[PDB]
Scaffold this active site. Structure first.
Site, PDB file in Angstrom:
ATOM      1  N   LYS A 150       7.455 -27.201 -20.674  1.00 52.91           N
ATOM      2  CA  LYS A 150       6.556 -26.090 -20.949  1.00 52.91           C
ATOM      3  C   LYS A 150       5.692 -26.442 -22.144  1.00 52.91           C
ATOM      4  CE  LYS A 150       5.631 -21.958 -19.270  1.00 52.91           C
ATOM      5  NZ  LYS A 150       5.881 -21.417 -17.897  1.00 52.91           N
TER       6      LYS A 150
ATOM      7  N   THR B  96      10.871 -23.387 -16.292  1.00 50.38           N
ATOM      8  CA  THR B  96      10.080 -23.591 -17.496  1.00 50.38           C
ATOM      9  C   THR B  96       9.824 -22.270 -18.207  1.00 50.38           C
ATOM     10  OG1 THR B  96       7.958 -23.430 -16.357  1.00 50.38           O
ATOM     11  CG2 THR B  96       9.023 -25.592 -16.441  1.00 50.38           C
TER      12      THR B  96
HETATM   13  O1  LIG Z   1       7.291 -25.162  -9.436  1.00 53.36           O
HETATM   14  C1  LIG Z   1       7.860 -24.758 -10.417  1.00 53.36           C
HETATM   15  N1  LIG Z   1       8.682 -25.591 -11.116  1.00 53.36           N
HETATM   16  C2  LIG Z   1       9.329 -25.173 -12.197  1.00 53.36           C
HETATM   17  O2  LIG Z   1      10.038 -25.933 -12.786  1.00 53.36           O
HETATM   18  C3  LIG Z   1       9.166 -23.872 -12.617  1.00 53.36           C
HETATM   19  N2  LIG Z   1       9.679 -23.175 -13.654  1.00 53.36           N
HETATM   20  N3  LIG Z   1       9.175 -21.920 -13.609  1.00 53.36           N
HETATM   21  N4  LIG Z   1       8.358 -21.831 -12.536  1.00 53.36           N
HETATM   22  C4  LIG Z   1       8.347 -23.033 -11.925  1.00 53.36           C
HETATM   23  N5  LIG Z   1       7.704 -23.485 -10.836  1.00 53.36           N
END
Ligand SMILES: O=c1[nH]c(=O)c2nn[nH]c2[nH]1
Ligand SMILES: O=c1[nH]c(=O)c2nn[nH]c2[nH]1
Ligand SMILES: O=c1[nH]c(=O)c2nn[nH]c2[nH]1
Ligand SMILES: O=c1[nH]c(=O)c2nn[nH]c2[nH]1
Lengths: 303, 303, 303, 303
Positions: free
Chosen positions: B6, B66
């Site tokens: 992130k 994330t």
């Molecule tokens: O495609 C995704 N991968 C991830 O790791 C993730 N984490 N939150 N949203 C997400 N979407």
């Protein structure tokens, strides 16, 4: 509409005549400008009926090249003997209309490119350097000036304003926003103690245009002083909204500077979203950046 | 390569534990940080072989979202009891690896979001405000920390560095660039007195990682002190090139901070083009912005 | 570390030798580049032990001015007789090391400045213009090359990589993100149908560095073709995560281009927040921009 | 002045009612918009005498929160049954004034967030995807609307304007700029064949405001058609200046769309500096980016 010109005309001058002899106010220690380094970003626009055929026929006979306008500005910053951006714009405008009699109107914007003092150790002590400056991307002064050639060939200033742009202030407590309309479109909670974060753009208009040039510097209103009024009033006020705050800043500006006719505010709300409201054994909180939409307020206070 | 995480995790904390008890140097009056307002922009990256099937099979069973990493960082800023960005990153990293035993590695970047003091008039005198701060878009401190879980399940810091980014300094005189190669590709004139304008990004590496955390603050190296060394050395030096300048800054840093192992510079040249070289009855000149291409230099000074 | 160089060396060439004879793939109509207009942004970094005293002593005797490197690049774009950015970097690197014997290492980055075709009408007939092009701020091709001088004075390419940057793709449906870890830090709801919005930077390496130059165009891999693979795979795939998607794009690239050794992805998640989930008598929904924090993924697929 | 509002209100709608039946012109094959994905960035400004005490006294009783204005816009995009940004703004304005009797004036700006089609393969057949779209940072449509509540409580549109922003076009040859004033400030050489690079912002007004809504698509003027007129006229014209070009574009627009009253241009000159004028055995040349100052032109053509 029919105008053309040049933007982003950067010009940096060393050792401009210093600004001194200013009149102080309680909110600000401002006492003048050294002008070892003086930077300005100028925009010039020009118009006049005699330019019509440059558009309708491609006839460039009466076209001052925009490149030549850039040369004009940069050369005039070298010869300018005054002390303010406002006065520089008047000098450019009068000189340009005198050079080019077929031009009926000129509009100028000047934005200060600000630099900050740095310190150095020499000869045993740390002191402000006369040589090394830090470029600042924070708030900066502005000036606006338009001039026209009248039918009888005399020249008149038709617009003049000064300003402060890019001021970003956050007050961590002592702000509320309550009592607003709560209907089917409202999801904002009432907040009796928010960390109000405002962007401020402030523009003022003098009663007498000569006061903006610095020729009698006791009548000049410095962006630095306006900045210090804004920060002081923000601190002093239990704010009830941005609207409420900017009215109070404007009132203080006009009280401190009776030679001003009015002051105009453009404010934006960038207050952070709260994440953690209570931290064990601490008065602190945690906030984060909001979604992109931002509130704004536009308000004129008059003398 | 296999990482995910992130970026732009903004987190603002009020009333973090103040930084005091620092060791001073001649070039800087820096004496600590109040931490009434403490802002950081964090980037988190995590890796580990057990994440493979999230890519190869779309199996999310071992995926920390994330979005959850963002929550983790923001919640840990609320509970952090230390005094430095460097220490905050260690706190986040250790806590994250302890929470998620299937993650093998975590890399963190933290960028200071800097705020400046403002002043207000209250009870008869103008004084620094404890409430109102000005957001700064100028230079900012940085910190880097990577941590790994070893095969035996112990944790180790694998990378740690601190830095200062976005410092923009111009020295109006007392700089030369002469004696360089003049051949069939050279159109740059020799200049015995140029207004050298440099952007500086400075990163330092401690001999002992513990010194970066502030737990014994006398061993901490503050970005503010590094900034003040850079401005002092720039002022003191008749520079012969940017290369020459940054070596001298690095030597001074390592002399002032014997607990540092090395310091790394990334510099950029943004020196203005000259427009007017001589102004009647004045030592001043006029300059303007150059074309976009910029020189850069990269150099490590080691203890 | 010890390097210096020049960034943002923009160079625009008209009438470069057209790229013809490329092998087409089903996913893309790409068959070459007319090269009426060819724009590149070059960054050059050079090193060598003999540069040491330019830093440690301010000795400029062996300093090629960075301004001169800019001239070198722009002049070599005029004399370049090839057809790709990759080949142009090789031409510059070889030429620079042949010119300056004290340079031991050169690193080059080249970023396409992309232009799109426009249409014009002539005697009633609308067709692509050979004169007017639209500057695009969307995705662009990239190239990287590192070349070293060996102790026996042979020159060797030690790293080569091509890429596509700035691709921003949103798929309105047919994407899920479910099954991830839910614990004290997890607030993200499971989503069986989201409008996944990804930024993609895709880089590839050839088994044989010669294939990147375009001399045998049938072996050249065009960024345009990679773009169209990415969109086709995104369309075809019921995605289970960005991780899942980029692995599948990578597999397809390596299937279509057996001359490639690896593909490396840097992706970012910019998916919008949902505001209105149901619209009467409509399949539509309303979304808006999220808060700043963004997810990212980094992954290498190998042949 | 006394207004407040919300900026950067992003709203994305899937499956808006398609725009169909747009009358074609020789310069453009545009006939409608599929509206699978419809994105807009809205700015709303409201005023009224009853807002005074929200500023002068901090009384929030009649303050619609700017956050609620954001909710209002996003919810109305969900309920909008029309087909254009212009019509969406009318829907929002009328609805807002019907809702909030204390508001006397509303000003709206809508900027398209443009998306482009991509390719996908099905059984080797490449076609445009109905799912995957590419976010474009190039040119985009705009709309402006001001509506007031009269003393008799009728609602009246007082200003309406549509536009195209962000169009950047370069014509490699077939442009001159000669015959301009040469005096003490002129250093620009005459150029009989330059690669004119213009940025264009084009705005139009309708004779009848109702034609802007798209309810009768045969009377609607699409930004895509204006774009294609601009590129065609640029190609066809041996330009004598930007001034000359934009007059001719304006004339063509007004000839193609007799329902328009006026076209207004804001153009900028970003033409590259020439570096290499002769390349052996080639018609090509090499150019680079200029210094920052840019020329601009502003011009209205009337029906
Ligand atoms: O495609 C995704 N991968 C991830 O790791 C993730 N984490 N939150 N949203 C997400 N979407
Ligand atoms: O100070 C504020 N004024 C406003 O109008 C407003 N609307 N939402 N939040 C707000 N805060
Ligand atoms: O300080 C400088 N170092 C350089 O390498 C250089 N090249 N051009 N100008 C320069 N200035
Ligand atoms: O088209 C142009 N118009 C101008 O006014 C101008 N001035 N310099 N170059 C120019 N080009």
């Amino acid at each position: 509409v029919m105008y053309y010109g040049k933007g982003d005309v950067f010009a940096y001058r060393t050792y401009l005549k210093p600004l001194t002899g200013v009149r102080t106010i309680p909110e600000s220690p401002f006492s003048g400008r050294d002008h070892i380094l003086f930077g300005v970003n100028v925009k010039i626009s020009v118009g006049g009926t005699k330019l019509l055929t440059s558009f309708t026929k491609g006839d460039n006979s009466l076209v001052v090249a925009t490149d030549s306008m850039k040369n004009f500005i940069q050369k005039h910053l070298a010869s300018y003997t005054g002390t303010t951006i406002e006065g520089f714009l008047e000098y450019v405008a009068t000189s340009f209309l005198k050079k080019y009699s077929h031009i009926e109107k000129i509009s100028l914007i000047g934005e200060e490119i600000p630099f900050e003092t740095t310190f150095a150790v020499k000869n045993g002590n740390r002191a402000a350097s006369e040589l090394v400056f830090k470029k600042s991307r924070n708030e900066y002064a502005t000036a606006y000036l338009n001039m026209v050639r009248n039918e009888d060939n005399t020249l008149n200033i038709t617009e003049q304003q000064s300003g402060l742009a890019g001021l970003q202030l956050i007050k961590v407590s002592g702000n509320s926003f309550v009592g607003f309309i709560r209907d089917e479109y409202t999801t904002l909670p009432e907040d009796s103690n928010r960390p109000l974060f405002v962007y401020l753009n402030i523009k003022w208009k003098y009663k007498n245009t000569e006061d903006s040039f610095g020729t009698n510097p006791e009548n000049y209103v410095a962006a630095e002083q306006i900045r210090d009024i804004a920060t002081s009033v923000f601190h002093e006020t239990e704010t009830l909204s941005i609207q409420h705050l900017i009215y109070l800043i404007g009132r203080r500006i006009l009280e401190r500077f009776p030679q001003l006719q009015e002051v105009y505010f453009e404010s934006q709300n960038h207050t952070w979203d709260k994440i953690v409201e209570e931290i064990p054994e601490s008065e602190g909180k945690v906030y984060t950046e909001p979604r992109p939409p931002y509130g704004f307020q536009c308000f004129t206070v008059t003398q």
